[PDB]
């Protein structure tokens, strides 16, 4: 039985030849929807997504190394890209021209656009143990922050910032006047950190984050909860029904309903309610890991990429296995009950 697309979701055309590392949907300032993917074949691709479900390959840029993160500028004219080639790039979509904007001493694992009242920069996190900020014109960073280890996962919702490193490092950042350290948090997970996602309260204000480890477990953590011993919790996920424990590769919050999606090495995506503390859906098992997922600006679209994630090392890598991006209509299923 063919289990490449058990949910039978929309399949993006011209999918990355190599494994897909990262996914990022255009901001609400563009009309329509555009999806960016980086891959381990060094490229970054753009597809327009219509409301009909069709996808049109738009353009493509290349690094000299695997692309590990992507994101957009607030206004939608630029795509930023973070590569294993120790560089980051700003892709001007009108001109289809990319230029370097960042230099690291190791691979760049995370990239994020910060629009603040008094400044706009891109934040890069690297395995060289720094967090840097570029103004997109100068070769010198506006700011360099020292991390406790190599940058694994990173998430930004102005004015909050969450960074996970190796050895379960977890730092929350304040961004209001200048980026600055706010709190180092003793980790709620006992295993390696892989992904992180900030969520908002009812005011649309960042109040906490979801953190995912390699150990089939996600932590839900509020920054200023009324009752920490009760309001911060973890939960098990991406396990079989002897139990197999898989890695959580990606977390994403529905921008409107505040529910969340997790995707894992087990080849399944799951939908949750961190408030009701319930599970809304678990997909059927794809025949390879789900490496990255992403919601569009209004949460009508859930993108999730089917690619090997090295979770079993090189022996289980089949380079002739094809990679897919699936699009799924999420407007109804991510609403709470």
């Amino acid at each position: 039985e063919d289990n490449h697309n058990p949910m039978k979701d929309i399949e993006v055309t011209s999918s990355p030849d190599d494994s897909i590392g990262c996914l990022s949907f255009s901001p609400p300032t563009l009309p329509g929807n555009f999806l960016i993917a980086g891959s381990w074949a060094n490229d970054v691709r753009c597809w327009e997504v219509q409301d009909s479900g069709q996808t049109i390959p738009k353009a493509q840029q290349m690094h000299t190394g695997p692309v590990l993160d992507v994101c957009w500028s607030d206004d939608g004219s630029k795509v930023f890209t973070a590569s294993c080639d120790k560089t980051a790039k700003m892709w001007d979509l009108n001109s289809n021209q990319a230029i370097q904007i960042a230099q690291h001493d190791a691979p760049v694992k995370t990239i994020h656009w910060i629009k603040a009242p008094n400044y706009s920069c891109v934040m890069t996190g690297s395995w060289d143990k720094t967090l840097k900020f570029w103004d997109t014109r100068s070769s010198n960073p506006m700011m360099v922050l020292q991390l406790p280890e190599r940058c694994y996962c990173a998430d930004v919702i102005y004015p909050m910032a969450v960074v996970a490193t190796a050895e379960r490092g977890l730092i929350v950042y304040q961004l209001e006047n200048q980026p600055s350290e706010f709190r180092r948090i003793e980790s709620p997970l006992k295993h390696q950190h892989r992904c992180v996602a900030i969520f908002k309260d009812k005011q649309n204000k960042p109040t906490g984050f979801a953190l995912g480890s390699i150990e089939g477990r996600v932590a839900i953590h509020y920054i200023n909860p009324p009752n920490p011993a009760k309001d911060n919790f973890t939960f098990k996920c991406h396990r079989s029904n002897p139990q197999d424990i898989y890695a959580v590769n990606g977390i994403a919050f529905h921008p409107v309903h505040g529910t969340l999606a997790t995707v894992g090495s087990d080849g399944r995506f799951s939908f949750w309610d961190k408030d009701a503390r319930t599970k809304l859906k678990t997909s059927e098992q794809l025949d390879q890991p789900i490496a990255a997922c992403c919601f569009n600006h209004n949460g009508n679209i859930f993108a999730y990429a089917s690619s090997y994630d090295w979770s079993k090392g090189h022996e289980f890598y089949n380079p002739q296995k094809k990679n897919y991006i699936f699009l799924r209509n999420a407007a109804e299923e991510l609403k709470p009950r």
Partner: protein, 52 residues
């Protein structure tokens, strides 16, 4: 020794369920031989060794 030259073997453990179960951890970085590196670090150095 970079990359993933040591054979993958899911570590054994124990957990509780809601009752008492045993687990296998299907992630190469759970093995002690790899627990100081991430999946992407391991894969990049396998890629630089043309170990695809």
């Amino acid at each position: 020794p970079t990359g993933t030259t040591i054979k993958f073997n899911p570590p054994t453990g124990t957990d509780t369920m809601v009752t008492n179960i045993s687990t296998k951890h299907q992630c190469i970085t759970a093995m002690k031989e790899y627990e100081s590196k991430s999946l992407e670090e391991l894969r990049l150095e396998d890629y630089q060794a043309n170990r695809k």
